[PDB]
Paper text:
We solved the crystal structure of an inactive DNA-free form of RecA, in which we were able to trace both loops L1 and L2. The RecA helical filaments in the crystals had six protomers per turn, with a 72.1-Å helical pitch, suggesting that this crystallographic filament reflects an inactive state. While loop L1 in the inactive RecA is unfolded, in the activated RecA–DNA complexes it forms a short helix (αL1) followed by a turn and an extended segment. Our study revealed that RecA actively selects single-stranded DNA for the primary DNA binding and that Asp-161 in loop L1 plays a crucial role in this mechanism.
In all organisms, this is catalyzed in an adenosine triphosphate (ATP)-dependent manner by the RecA-family recombinases, including bacterial RecA and eukaryotic Rad51 and Dmc1, among which Escherichia coli (E. coli) RecA has been most thoroughly studied for decades ((5,6); see for reviews).
Residue numbers in the entry: 6 to 332
Write the structure that this text describes.
Amino acid sequence: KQKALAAALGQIEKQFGKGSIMRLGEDRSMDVETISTGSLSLDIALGAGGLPMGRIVEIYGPESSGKTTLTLQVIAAAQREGKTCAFIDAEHALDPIYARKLGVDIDNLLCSQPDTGEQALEICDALARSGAVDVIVVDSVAALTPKAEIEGEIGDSHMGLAARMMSQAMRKLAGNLKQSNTLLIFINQIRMKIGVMFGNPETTTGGNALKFYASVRLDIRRIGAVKEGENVVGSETRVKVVKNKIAAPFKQAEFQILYGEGINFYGELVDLGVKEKLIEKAGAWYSYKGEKIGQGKANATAWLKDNPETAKEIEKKVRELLLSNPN
Ligand SMILES: [Mg+2]
C-alpha cells in the first residue's frame, strides 16, 4: 500500500508533527537553522548538517568521552557565525585554554555558575525568553544539584528530585527556546550504578523530561586512541545520534579528537571525501579533481588544511551528497 502508506504517514505527521515518523533512509530533514558540531561526519549523522537552533539537544557520554570538545566546538562554531553563547556551568570544569584552542571566544562567552540546579534551569529559561542568546550549553545535567539535595533534605531520592527538577522546567524551556530560536545543549552522562539496570542501561541522568523533549540526543564515547608514534595524541571518537527529530536518527559519526587541537575535521573530510569518491586515494597519490593533494591520509589532511578553499569545496559536495535534504 505505497500510496496508503504515504497518506497514513502524512496523516500521522499531520496529527503528530513532521518527522514524528519517517523511513530511516529518507533524505528528509527539518528546515531548521543549524550550527556545526565541528565534526563533518556528525553534522552529517545529524542529517540537517548541525545541531538545530531553537531545540534542546542532549549530549551524553563518559568523562573524556569528547562531549566537552563537542560542546566547545559548537560554541566555537556558533560564535564564528556571530552567535551569542551562554555556558551554564554547574560542573566548574571549563578549560578556557583548551576552549580557545578549539576556537571558543572565551572573552565573549557568557557564563553562569548557578547556586542550584533549579536556578540553573531558570537562568536557561530566562536566557531562552530573552531571545538574545543563540546557544546555551548546560554543563551538566548530573551536576545540576536540586536545591534540596544541596540543603541535605536529600530524604526524597536524588534520582527522584533531579528528575522532578528537570521535568518541571523542560516544557517551558523547550517552548521559549523554540520562540527565541535558541539552541540549548544539555551535557549528561549515563546515570550512576544503583539500577540494576533496567531499563536501557544507557539511561542518562535527570529523568525523562530531557529524554523526550530533546530534538536531538547524542551518545558520545571514546572508542580508542589516536597515536602518532608510540605517543598518544588523541581519542578516536564515536558519536551515535540516538534520537533525531530534525532528520532520521541512529546515524553515527566517528572522528578523532586530537589533544590540544580538537576534532580532526580534515581527517573526516579526507575520509568522507574518499568514501564519496570525491577524493581519489589510489596509486601513490590522493587527489581531488585530478590534482595531487597528498601521499597518505595524513598528508591529504594537512593539504586540505592548507587549502581551505578546496577543503570547503569538498565539504560542500560532501554535504550535498550526504546531508539528508531533498535532492
Ligand atoms: Mg593517485
